[PDB]
Every structure is written in C-alpha cells, then in structure tokens.
Design a protein around this ligand. Structure first.
Ligand code: K
Ligand code: K
Ligand code: K
Ligand code: K
Ligand code: K
Ligand code: MG
Ligand code: MG
Ligand code: MG
Ligand code: MG
Ligand code: MG
Ligand code: MG
Ligand code: MG
Ligand code: MG
Ligand code: MG
Ligand code: MG
Ligand code: MG
Ligand code: MG
Ligand code: MG
Ligand code: MG
Ligand code: MG
Ligand code: MG
Ligand code: MG
Ligand code: MG
Ligand code: MG
Ligand code: MG
Ligand code: MG
Ligand code: MG
Ligand code: MG
Ligand code: MG
Ligand code: MG
Ligand code: MG
Ligand code: MG
Ligand code: MG
Ligand code: MG
Ligand code: NA
Ligand code: NA
Ligand code: NA
Ligand code: NA
Lengths: 68, 145, 96, 128, 144, 229, 197, 49
RNA sequence: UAAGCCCAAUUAGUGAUUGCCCAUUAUUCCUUUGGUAAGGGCGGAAACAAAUGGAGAAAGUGUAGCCCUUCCGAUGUAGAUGUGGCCUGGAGGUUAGGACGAAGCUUAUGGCGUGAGCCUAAGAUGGACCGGCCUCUAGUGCAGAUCUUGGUUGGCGUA
RNA sequence: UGCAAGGCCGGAAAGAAAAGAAUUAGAGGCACCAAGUGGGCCUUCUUCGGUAAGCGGAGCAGGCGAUGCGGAAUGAACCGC
RNA sequence: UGAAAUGAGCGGAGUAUUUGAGCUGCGCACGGCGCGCCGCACGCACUGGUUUCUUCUCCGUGAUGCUCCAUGUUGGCGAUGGAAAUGGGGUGCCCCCACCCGUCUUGAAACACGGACCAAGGAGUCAAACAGACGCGCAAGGGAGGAGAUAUGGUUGCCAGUACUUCUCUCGUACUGAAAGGGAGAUGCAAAAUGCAUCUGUGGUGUGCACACGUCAAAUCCGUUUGAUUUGCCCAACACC
C-alpha cells in the first residue's frame, strides 16, 4: 500500500509557533579556537600581561582608598 | 515561645473547635463572640480575649483572659457579672479594656443577650399558659439530695 | 424563531410611519381556559369572574416597512396557540 | 427572626444538566457525565442538542447558597449547635440532621424558639 | 499512595492518556535494550556514547582491599584535628599528630593552602603536598 | 476621643482635599485656554486655505492641497483565513478585531504597510469632528495595563506626564495636526472599538472604487465612521 | 473574535505561595509579604520573592564564600562605615578550607552547627529574619547573597553527552561502561569536545 | 452627548456652542450671506482689474 | 405590466448623501470564571442595653472565596496539568447521632451546587447500627470489551 | 611616530536632526521533565505524470481533521464569522 | 425614590462674562505686474478696536462611611382560609429547532463493526534500578543495614511497635591513564628540570540582584516614592581567557 512520500506543508507554521529565534550576538561565544595560530599565541601573551596589569591596578586602588 | 501566629497556622485547618458543615466553617469555641473561624475571634487561641456570656436572669457576664496566667488553665478565664439593665456600651467598654478590636462585636452580642433573655421570658410565659390547660399523664421530679 | 419577541399585524396599519405611532401602546391577547380562576377585582367585582383570560404586553418597535410591529409580552412569551388569533392594541398610554 | 434582605436571586438556569440519552436506558442515571464520543452531537455543540455545563452558568456570588426563605442552611445535630447561630441568626438557619431522633428534636425545637434561631425543617406549627 | 496517581484522574477518560491512534500496545519497541544498533541507535549514541565495544586490559580476580587508597588534601586536614589542638598549633612549636590510616586515609594529596600546621602519618604523599607541608611548618612521617 | 495617628491622618487628608480642589481648578483653566487657542487655529487655517484657493482661481492658477498627514484605518473583516504577512501587519497596526480603528501617520513606510492589507481594512483621511467623536465617545487610555475610559483631563495628564498633553483637546489636536507627539498620544490609547455601521456596508469583498468597501475612501471615510462611532 | 494567536506563550509561571509545609517558613513569608507591600525597599521585594522559591532554587552558600565577598566589599568601603549584614535566603554551611574568618553579622534561614559555631567563635553573630526585619526593616546596609548551583551533579548531567561540544556526564552506575565507541578515536569515532556557537 | 462629560473634558464647549447658536441665527445668517457675497465679489473684481 | 436577465436607486428633478429582515460576529449592559492580573482597606474612629437601623471586617494560592473597586481572556480531538473539587471500603484522631427508629431501600420531597454530588421531607419502608471534620490507606466510581455470572424479556399462545 | 591585536586613560554623543524618514495587545534570553503524533485530506495560485478521473505526485499559504454558529434548499473543505 | 443627587442639569449669587458673526487700525505674510507699485476674499501678531447682532456667568458641600443590606406613589389580591401569591415538580398541547450511540478512520446518520433489558462483577497494579520536579532532616559530611542491648528477664493482648547503641559498611568531600602509576590555592619576587617568601582570601576581563554614594525628571497629603542614571562592590548566573 503506497503512502505519501514527502511534504513541507505545515513545517513553516510549526517553526514560527515558537518563532525563528535570532542569532546569538557577536559579543557572546566569540571564541578564537581554531583561528590562525600565530596571532592567537601573540594575543595570549598580551592577555597575560593585561591580567598582571589588572592585578597591579587593583592593588594601587586599594592602597589609594586606604590612604585617603 | 509559641505565639498566636504560630498556633493559628498549626490549627487553622484542623481543630476540635472548627465546625465545617455544608461548606460553612463555624466555631463552637466558648470564647468566640461570633462563631466565625478567624484568628481574631479565636478566644481560646489569643493571648488576651473577652467573651460576652449570659447569666442567671437578665445579667450579662464578661469572661476575660488577661494573659497573666495563660499557663494556668483554671486561672486563665475570670468572670465578672454585670447586673441586669447594664448598657451594651458598658459591656463593650469592658471587653475593649482587654481587646479593643472586639468592641463592636461585643456591643452587638451584649444587645443580643438582652434580647434573648426578654424573648425567653416571653416564650416561657406563653408555654406555661398552654401547659396549665393540659392534664399530663406523667411528671418527672428529680429527687432532692 | 426567537419567541421572546412577537409580530403583530394591525388592521389599517400598512406603513412604517403608521406603526411608529403605536410604539409603547398596550397589547392584549384574550382567550379562555377550562376553569374559572382568579382575576383582577375578583372580590370587588364578582361579575368579572370567568374562564376568559388576558396576556398583556407593549409595542416596542415597528417591524419592516408595511406597518408590522414588534411586541414584547410581560415576562413570559405569548403562547404559540395565539398565532393567527386576535390581538387587541389599545390607545393607551396616550401621547395626545 | 427575619432573614437579611439580599438582591433578587437570578438563577441563570433552572433545568438540570442530565446525561445524554439517559431517558432511553433505565440503567443510565440522569447524573451528568461529560460526553467523550468522537461523533457525539452533544460534545460537538449541535444546535438542537442538550447543553453542557461550564463556567458561564455559575450563579451570582452575592446570592449563592441562599435558600428561598432567605437564609443559608447550616446542618445541626443537637441543642448546643444552636449557640453557634445566636449572633448571625439573620444569615444562617439550622437544619436538623435526618437521623436526629424525635426525642432530641423536641429539645432542639424548643431551644431554637427561645433563641429566635430559624430552623429550616423544624416544627412549622410553631412560629405561625 | 494510589489516590495520588493519574489513574484516579483518568477514570472515565477511556484511553487513559495513551491515544486513540497509537494505543497502549504490549511492546512496540522491543524488550529491554533491544535494537541498540538497530532502530534505537540514535538514542544510544547521543545519550550513551561509548556503550559498545571493548577497552583495555583485563584484571582477573580483582581484590579491592589491596587497592584501598583513599586520599585527603592539605586544606581538609582540619577535619582530622580536634579544635583544641588546632588552636594551640603554631608554626615552630608543638603540633598535633594526624594518623591517616587510623582516620581512613592512605595518601596526602595537597590541594590548596593548609590551614593548621600538623604532623601527618601517611602511607603515601604527593610531592607537592610534602613540599607545602614542610614550608608551612608541618611534617609528613611515613607509616604502614 | 481620637487617637494621635488618626488625628495626623485627618490633618493630612484635609490638606490633600485642599490640594485636590486647587489642582482641579487649575487644570480646568489650562484646558480652557488651550481649547480656545486650538479652536481659533482651526478657524484661521480654514479661512486661510479658502482665501488661497480664491486667489489661485481668480488668475486661472490651481491650488495644490497638502497631502494628508493622518489616516484613520478600521478593520472590516474577521480573523479567519489570513495569510501570515497580512496577519503580522494587522497586528502591528493593532487591528486584531473587526471594526478596530486606529490613527496612523500617512507616510511612505505606513502607506506600503496599508497597501499590503487593503482587503482587510477601510481607511481614509479624518476630519476634526471624526477625531473629536472618537476621542470623546470611544477614547480609552492604557493605564496600568487596563483599558480605562477617558472621563476627565486629570487621567489624561497623569497618563502622559507631558506639558503639551494635559486635556482631551490636546489629544485631539495632536492627532488631527500630526504633532510631534502623534506616536505618544496614539500609542497611549487603547485601539478604538467601534460598532458596525448603521445602515450596513455595500460590499466588503470589493474595493470601494469597485463599488465595495475595502479601499481608500479619501474623505468619505468620515461618513462611514459617523455611522459607526 | 480577537486575533490573539500565541497569546498564551506570553504567560509565565509565577508562584505566589510556597510549596513548603514549614509553619515557620510561612510566618516569615507573612512578615516579608507585608514589608514588601508596605515599604519602598528593593531588598524587601527580593527577600519576599526568594522566600517562596523551592529548596533547589535556594542554593546553600559556604562561610568561606561569604567571607571572601565581604572582604571584596570591605576594601573600598569607608573606615567610618560599619560592615553590612550578610543576608542569605537559604542555608549557610561551614567551610573547612577557611580556618580564619572575620567577625560578621549573618542572617540566614538556617545555619549548620559548625557554621554557627565558626561565626560565633570569630566574634560575629547569627541572625534570624525576624531580627533582621526588626533592626533593618528596609534592608539598609545589607549584602544580599545567593548560593551556588552550577556545580551540582544534576546540572553536570543535563544535556546529551553524545553531541559535539558537549561535556555532560551520562546516566550510568557503572563508570567503566560506556567508554569505547563514540568516546575514542580508535573505536569508530570520538564525540567532538568543542563546537563553535 | 452627555452634558457633564462633554463640559468636563472641554470647558470651552460652552463658548463653541454659543458660537454655533449665533451662526444658526437666521438674521445673522442672512446678513452674513449678503456681506460675504458682496465683499468676495469686490475682491475678485479688484484683483482682476 | 416577472417573482427572468443586465444595470441603477431607497421613498425620489423636493430641496441632500442609514428602505427593510435574519448570527454563538461587532458595540454596550448584567452575571460567572481564570488571570504573567491592576489597585484600595485590614492600629476596630467616636457614640449606641432590653421592654420596642442591622450584620460583617481573616495580612489572605486554593473554601460559603477577608472585603471592595478595576481591566482583559473564555470553544476545542489526541494530550498535559490543576482543583480547602465530588464520591467508595478500611485505619489513626476528633466531634456527634440512634428503640421517640441506625444501615439499606422507595419518590410528580423539595432545597443547594456551572458540575461530580450534598442535604432535608415522606414511607400507610426497615429493625440495629451509624454521620460530619483532619490525617492515613486501597481489590475506590461503568453503558457497550461477539465482556463474566444470575435473572428477565419482545418474538408468542406463535412455529 | 606606520600596520595587526588586547587593554588603559580622556573626549564627544540631533541616544539619533531635516528630507513622507516606521510600527508594535514588542517583558528579551536561559534551562529542566515529559505526553500525544510520525496513515492525513481539501482549496486559491504555481506545478509534474496521465485522454481523463471525486486519479496519482509536489511548492507557497490557508482550511478541515479538532468546530460548532449564520448563509449557499441539501454537502467535513465554499461564503460570512 | 435620595442611605454621601459633583450637575451648563442640584444649591446660592449677579446682569454681567466673552464666543462667534459683521465693520474696521498698523505691521507681516499671500496674489498679479517687474524696482516697489496695485490688490488683498479679510490668514498671523497687537490675545488690536467697535460692541451693531448672537451667548447666560461665577461660586459651592471628603469618606469621622472598611464592607454588605435596609427608606416612594396609586389600585388589585391577601382580614388565618381546604386562603392568596411566587418558585419548583408532573402530564398534555401549540410554534420553532433537532439524523444513532460507542468505535477505527482524511471522511460515520451510514448499505462500516459492537450494540433486547436489569442486577452484581469488570481493566495502569505491586516490586526493584535510575532520573527530574516538589516537601522534610542534616550538611563536607549524610545515612544505613544486619545485629545487639533493655524498658521487655514483662505482658492474652496493646508491644511484629516505640526508645537506645555501632573504630563497621555505603554514598560523597578528586580526578585521571589501557595500564605501571601520578594527582589540582592565591599573591609577590624572580625564571631554580620539586625556585623562594607571605597567608583576611573573589586568578583576570565583559555583562549582571540587592546595598552604599550621589545626580536628574514626574508626582506628593511636603513625611516623601515612582522611575532613570553616575560611581563602588558586585551575589547567583552567562560569555571570553
Ligand atoms: K489516525
Ligand atoms: K476576579
Ligand atoms: K488562602
Ligand atoms: K462510554
Ligand atoms: K413472549
Ligand atoms: Mg507517512
Ligand atoms: Mg469603638
Ligand atoms: Mg471527527
Ligand atoms: Mg431514615
Ligand atoms: Mg479527552
Ligand atoms: Mg500520556
Ligand atoms: Mg506508540
Ligand atoms: Mg500509525
Ligand atoms: Mg583487543
Ligand atoms: Mg450586504
Ligand atoms: Mg474571499
Ligand atoms: Mg564541584
Ligand atoms: Mg429626497
Ligand atoms: Mg477550554
Ligand atoms: Mg476493600
Ligand atoms: Mg416516577
Ligand atoms: Mg478494581
Ligand atoms: Mg452495572
Ligand atoms: Mg528624521
Ligand atoms: Mg445551512
Ligand atoms: Mg445654575
Ligand atoms: Mg429600596
Ligand atoms: Mg476507509
Ligand atoms: Mg484522526
Ligand atoms: Mg460515529
Ligand atoms: Mg450508503
Ligand atoms: Mg471502520
Ligand atoms: Mg472490525
Ligand atoms: Mg565527583
Ligand atoms: Na440548577
Ligand atoms: Na455569546
Ligand atoms: Na470578566
Ligand atoms: Na463545496
């Protein structure tokens, strides 16, 4: 007994019932995994120095607040 | 240590004084001026409470739990009797001396007590008149001791 | 059909303007039962006692363009046995 | 005692919601049952079929549970139950339980007369 | 309790939530874990990856008592020291002695900062743990 | 006697009553002046247009009337068998029910939206009387999520919290002249819900120029809406 | 009729009563329902909302976490101002990894015996929410805190473990089972550890 | 249509209604009709000239 | 001299732009119910016996809903969920009834509830048990499975 | 001192003018646990095989199925709703 | 039927008030002619002037009422009766509606199947493993279980319960490698094939409750509180490292 082969009749209605959700904004899930390696390695060294500077800046702010 | 708020939570849904009949929640609490099952009207639950009761004749009795001896059940409730002819506002003031939030219901109950005493006398007189014209086969007499 | 509203055709009333004149007038359907039951002035006027009965109503609005009017009866609807029978349209309440 | 005067009782519907085709089968009680047949005309809301109960038929809250006398029925079983109705005697009227004996009913009726507490099924010879 | 079940709610619903078309049949999918590679492959693969196949060497007659080796870190050592001993414990002075094997531990691991210095009797110790405890002023003594 | 806190509340309430009466009187004066200013502006604008038409005619020229800025749109069809594009546009227009009515700016972005949904709507260019009747008789504001009938100018001023919108005449003027607060005024109101037109329609399935009802009726929407308002 | 397709999808599940059977929980809800309604305090509104939440949605907090966050707030705080009261709608648990803590005032639904002992021995004090309402009726000088829930085994199990980029733990009592095919490159394939989003 | 509501919303409606009564006054109407026609005709002739 | 077909009107060259009739649609009014609901009140204001203004006022998910005001939605197979939602046998508590009549049974016995059902009345029924409420518990609700058992029944005073 | 990148310190911000110069009964995102369904059918336009079919087979979208009500005398799908 | 009559309507007060229409002043716009000239229907400002016609104008009552119920007129009927009314119930009749239930099915009133009546019986249960939601206890620890112990070495029975105990066992506080086997803090200084020192501490950054400083706007009964925002810390969370 033959039956129906394929259809897309109601699929658009089902998809839009909860809506076609918009894409994740570019500022989230912006991982650089798998990108060009030499730039990634160079950026890692910069970020490590930035973390050290961030630690020093907070130490200075703590001392400044304590003194004042 | 255990407040009225905690006790009301414990007993609101189940209590020997709660009478849920035909969908109607009433109270046979002897210290309830209304019969309604609310925290305010629960005289047995509240730390301080007052109730308007009748007395022998047309007198109106006010029973007061002042909170000083709530752990002594025989000393918990004190009765003060107002002689017949007492104004209902005086009874309301007596209740309000302990529970100011029961003044209005106490006044109405004091009025109702007076009305019931008058109606009871009137009904009893009519019943005696009817009974005096009937020859009763039997009459029970409690033996004196 | 909707039995809460009755349609009455009145002799010599053949225009909507004619039926407008009768808006608010009292309408009475007269019939009889089997037994003599209570009526108005049963005690005051015993001569009124009869099997004759009446059901009252008022004209609400004209129906159509040919003098037909809509009539609403007091509380209950007019019985279906009254279809094709006489209806009395009085001149009161009077606006004249 | 006179009951408290309320607004006119409307009673949206008077007829019962009886079971479909109960009149054709004696074993079928008239108690309402929701028809679940796939082709049931009652469930499909055909014009000339029996109606189904729903939220719209609910009665007005201000006059709900009010008997024609104007009171609300509160079942009672002994004399002491009457004292619950002393204050709100214009709102509630006592209904003596059917199994309460005639001996006890005599005391209940007499006490109710003195207290001016209405009894829905008390002695109608009294109260005139 | 039976009165809380969907069966009570379904009295009079005929199909009891199983449908008119599909119905509640006996075994529509096969019994147990049948068809793990046929007609149930997607469920098995997406929820239980690794289920099929073999891996690694065999160890006949495994005895877990010889392999008994519970571990405790440096930052958890206060759990085995009484409060009075911990208060009196200071670096360079008299210190409490912790017997790990009598406390149910075999190896000292050494995660985190040790709170109270102490002497630890252990069967095993990680190199970082041994270094940190000596720096903090404690010591590790081997036991059996 | 009276408790101390009861006395304090009594003092506050007396002052609140005094402020309420004074604020009511001040609002009435402000609304009176604004209504007078608007009424003279409408009269002057009409007279100026009449003179400008006469001056053009007297020398054989033509006066080009300004393109209408405000359109009034009502829905003349049910909610059955609507394609998704038309469904979303009607939702954006807030025409979710038959005989729902709204005021829209007659700019090109709105014109294309209206054109895509012509068979479901009947629209035109409202007059001052049409705007006044809808605001006064069918005007409802969105207050705390509720559809509240406009019954005084105090609820208007509290709803909008704007110096330029304090009375019903301010609301009418903003809609009719398409002021800077057209969106704010129109969005603050519940969509108008009108009765069916007494006398009936002609043909809802055909365009007005075809002898039907769903087209742009220009100024003939005013007599269409008069039988509805 | 009114076109309202999908209007029910706007509705959200908002609970107004607790599922808890605890009478003392109910008393606190009654107290802070009144305070949230009758006071202009964001703190009271949040505390009332959190008193209704389920036990799983009232995560426990550790004493070490409390001590750390107060220290972060204690720095950059004026020397003339008193430290705020740590308020936790939930259980407060002791931490054996922090021996030394400062003296803090902590209000919580419940304290563990060790946690309460640690707080008292440090010179602090433990407060119940009725005392907090008495001394901070609007929540002035309070530090509202929440416990952690992302490290729970239930959370770590959520999601399919066989899809690329997933690192959820499977539901298996036998750790050694489910380790061969779909988990190793040498057995057919290995599920990808990372996937861009 | 309601008097209180219309006046409450628009305190100026009494002034507008008074203006409407004057415009509908028959003596005012005929006099205005004569004056309007005369002065519009004069303006047209002067502009043409 | 359509009650047919095409076109065009609304009482008609008069003076203006709604002929009339039918909806589970629209507007509006009343009532119910549910909200992602919106607000207000809840420190008894004062005073007030009977013979001869009243009653209530609960900090509250859900009840006869604490009360009041306001706004919006309301159909639905398969299916999901909720219900101080209904009903049955038994247990732990509590409170009652019964020889002046329990259970069961009967009904043109009415009343209440949208409903599941509850309650009263009558028995010219019955003759000894049993109701309400909170909690616990289960072999817990029937219209039909060519369903099981028992009885009955039209065919039929027929073949 | 240019370029690439990650940050730090400042500045300016019709918060987006004017020119038809948007609108919204627009609370965005994030999870968790699961049911039924996985025979469809019809229609406007597009469309393939077939002489054709109340035939078979697709696209976009509505509808029935799951739904009555008011209409086309009668009709699951047409008109109105 | 006035149990708070918010009224252009009710109550007081006074012949006034200013809307429009006509008629007109200056300036500016506007129109026709090519520089300022003519016109201007009467537009804008002076809230211009004239009041010749047309209008009514102003002021006024908080709740010390939290909620519900309770206040007319004229007749008919009803004066205790087997009464009068209203509602309910029963039976019949009119006019209009109205295909037989259950089921499978795209589609059932179906020439699709089960379907004479009634009574009683008749179908998601128990156990074990796991998971999530919700309730409860405790918490870096939780909990047994088996078994003992004695109140009970007593009692028909209540008592097969309740009360008490466990260097154990089990699930966790640590995870990885096929295994041999290894096994996770921060900061500072410095770069030692186990580098040193300190121990009140979120490893860093971005977004982010409350709270704390202020700062604007709206509304206040003038006590404040409804939003927004700067800065600080940022809780829980999410994303890059
Ligand atoms: K099917
Ligand atoms: K409601
Ligand atoms: K409640
Ligand atoms: K059935
Ligand atoms: K026979
Ligand atoms: Mg298929
Ligand atoms: Mg008082
Ligand atoms: Mg069907
Ligand atoms: Mg009986
Ligand atoms: Mg169903
Ligand atoms: Mg299911
Ligand atoms: Mg299946
Ligand atoms: Mg199938
Ligand atoms: Mg191998
Ligand atoms: Mg038509
Ligand atoms: Mg069409
Ligand atoms: Mg963890
Ligand atoms: Mg004409
Ligand atoms: Mg529904
Ligand atoms: Mg049994
Ligand atoms: Mg019968
Ligand atoms: Mg069974
Ligand atoms: Mg049966
Ligand atoms: Mg722009
Ligand atoms: Mg039809
Ligand atoms: Mg006046
Ligand atoms: Mg009245
Ligand atoms: Mg078939
Ligand atoms: Mg189907
Ligand atoms: Mg069928
Ligand atoms: Mg056939
Ligand atoms: Mg079949
Ligand atoms: Mg078959
Ligand atoms: Mg682990
Ligand atoms: Na009914
Ligand atoms: Na309807
Ligand atoms: Na409603
Ligand atoms: Na058709």
């Amino acid at each position: 007994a033959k039956s129906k082969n394929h259809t897309n009749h109601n699929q658009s209605s089902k998809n839009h019932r909860n809506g076609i959700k918009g894409p994740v904004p570019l500022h989230l899930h912006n991982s650089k995994r798998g990108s060009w390696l030499p730039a990634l390695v160079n950026a890692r060294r910069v970020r490590k120095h930035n973390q050290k500077a961030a630690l020093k800046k907070r130490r200075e702010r703590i001392a400044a607040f304590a003194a004042k | 240590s255990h407040s009225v708020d905690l006790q009301w939570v414990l007993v609101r849904q189940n209590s020997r004084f709660l009478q849920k009949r035909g969908g109607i929640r009433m109270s046979n609490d002897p210290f309830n001026n209304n019969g309604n099952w609310t925290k305010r009207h629960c005289g047995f639950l509240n730390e301080k409470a007052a109730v308007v009761k009748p007395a022998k004749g047309g007198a109106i009795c006010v029973t007061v739990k002042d909170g000083s001896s709530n752990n002594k059940p025989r000393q918990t409730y004190k009765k003060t009797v107002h002689a017949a002819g007492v104004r209902a506002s005086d009874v309301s003031r007596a209740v309000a001396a302990v529970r100011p939030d029961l003044a209005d219901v106490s006044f109405r109950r004091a009025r109702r007590m007076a009305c019931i005493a008058s109606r009871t006398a009137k009904v009893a007189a009519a019943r005696k008149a009817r009974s005096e014209k009937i020859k009763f086969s039997r009459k029970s007499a409690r033996a004196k001791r | 059909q909707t039995k809460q509203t009755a349609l009455v055709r009145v002799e010599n009333v053949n225009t909507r303007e004619d039926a407008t004149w009768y808006v608010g007038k009292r309408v009475c359907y007269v019939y009889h039962g089997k037994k003599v039951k209570r009526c108005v002035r049963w005690s005051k006027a015993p001569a009124r006692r009869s099997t004759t009965r009446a059901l009252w109503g008022r004209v609400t609005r004209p129906h159509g363009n040919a003098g037909m009017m809509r009539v609403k009866f007091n509380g209950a609807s007019v019985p279906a046995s009254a279809i094709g029978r006489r209806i009395r349209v009085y001149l009161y309440p009077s606006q004249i | 005692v006179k009951p408290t005067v309320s607004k006119a009782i409307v009673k949206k519907r008077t007829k019962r919601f009886t079971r479909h085709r109960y009149e054709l089968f004696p074993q079928l009680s008239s108690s309402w049952r929701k028809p679940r047949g796939e082709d049931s005309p009652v469930r499909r809301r055909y014009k000339g079929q029996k109606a189904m109960p729903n939220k719209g038929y609910g009665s007005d809250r201000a006059t709900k549970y009010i008997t024609p006398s104007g009171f609300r029925n509160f079942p009672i079983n002994n004399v002491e139950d009457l004292y619950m109705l002393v204050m709100q005697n214009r709102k509630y009227a006592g209904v003596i339980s059917h199994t309460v004996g005639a001996r006890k009913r005599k005391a209940i009726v007499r006490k109710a007369m003195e207290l001016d507490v209405r009894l829905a099924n008390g002695n109608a010879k009294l109260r005139k | 309790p039976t009165r809380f079940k969907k069966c009570r709610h379904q009295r009079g619903s005929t199909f009891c939530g199983y449908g008119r078309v599909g119905k509640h049949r006996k075994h529509e999918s096969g019994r147990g874990n049948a068809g793990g590679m046929h007609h149930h492959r997607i469920n098995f693969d997406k929820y239980h990856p690794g289920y099929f196949g073999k891996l690694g060497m065999d160890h006949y007659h495994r005895k877990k008592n010889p392999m008994w080796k519970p571990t405790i870190n440096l930052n958890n050592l206060s759990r085995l020291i009484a409060a009075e001993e911990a208060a009196k414990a200071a670096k360079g002075g008299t210190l409490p002695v912790v017997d790990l094997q009598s406390s149910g531990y075999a190896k000292l691991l050494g995660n985190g900062h040790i709170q109270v210095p102490c002497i630890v009797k252990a069967r095993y110790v990680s190199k970082l743990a041994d270094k940190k405890i000596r720096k903090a002023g404690g010591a590790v003594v081997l036991q059996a | 006697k009276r408790a101390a806190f009861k006395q304090q509340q009594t003092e506050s309430f007396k002052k609140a009553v005094v402020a309420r009466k004074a604020a009511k009187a001040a609002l009435k004066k402000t609304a009176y002046l604004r209504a007078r200013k608007y009424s003279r502006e409408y009269r002057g604008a009409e007279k100026k247009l009449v003179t400008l038409r006469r001056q053009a005619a007297s020398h054989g020229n033509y006066y080009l009337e300004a393109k209408p800025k405000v359109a009034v749109v009502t829905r003349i069809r049910g909610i059955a068998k609507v394609n998704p594009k038309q469904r979303k546009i009607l939702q954006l227009l807030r025409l979710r029910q038959i005989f729902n009515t709204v005021f829209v700016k007659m700019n090109k972005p709105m014109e294309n939206m209206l054109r895509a949904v012509e068979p479901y709507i009947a629209y035109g260019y409202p007059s001052l009387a049409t705007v006044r009747a809808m605001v006064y008789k069918r005007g409802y504001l969105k207050i705390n999520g509720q559809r509240v009938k406009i019954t005084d100018n105090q609820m208007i001023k509290d709803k909008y919290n704007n110096v330029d919108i304090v009375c019903a005449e301010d609301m009418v003027n903003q809609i009719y002249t398409c002021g800077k607060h057209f969106r704010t005024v129109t969005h603050g109101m519940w969509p108008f819900k009108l009765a069916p037109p007494a006398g009936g329609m002609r043909q809802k399935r055909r365009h007005f120029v075809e002898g039907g009802d769903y087209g742009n009726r220009d100024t003939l929407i005013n007599r269409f809406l008069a039988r509805m308002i | 009729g009114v076109d309202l397709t999908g209007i029910s999808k706007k509705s959200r599940v908002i609970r107004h009563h607790t599922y808890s059977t605890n009478p003392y929980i109910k008393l606190l809800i009654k107290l802070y329902k009144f305070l949230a309604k009758r006071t202009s305090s964001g703190f009271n509104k949040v505390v009332y909302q959190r008193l209704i939440k389920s036990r799983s949605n009232r995560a426990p907090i550790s004493l070490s976490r409390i001590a750390v966050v107060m220290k972060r707030k204690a720095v950059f705080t004026a020397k003339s101002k008193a430290a705020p009261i740590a308020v936790v709608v939930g259980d407060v648990l002791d931490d054996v990894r922090m021996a030394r803590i400062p003296a803090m005032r902590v209000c919580a639904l419940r304290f563990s015996k060790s946690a309460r002992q640690s707080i008292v021995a440090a010179g602090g004090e433990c407060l119940t929410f009725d005392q907090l309402a008495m001394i901070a009726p609007t929540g002035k000088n309070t530090y509202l805190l929440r416990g952690r829930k992302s490290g729970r085994e239930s959370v770590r199990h959520f999601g399919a473990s066989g899809v690329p980029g997933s690192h959820s733990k499977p539901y298996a009592t036998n750790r050694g089972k489910e380790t061969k095919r779909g988990r190793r490159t040498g057995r057919s394939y290995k599920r990808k550890a990372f996937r861009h989003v | 249509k309601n008097r209180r509501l219309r006046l409450r919303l628009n305190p100026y409606v009494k002034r507008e209604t008074a203006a409407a009564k004057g415009m509908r006054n028959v003596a005012n109407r005929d006099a205005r009709r004569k004056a309007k026609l005369a002065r519009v005709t004069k303006a047209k002739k002067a502009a043409t000239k």
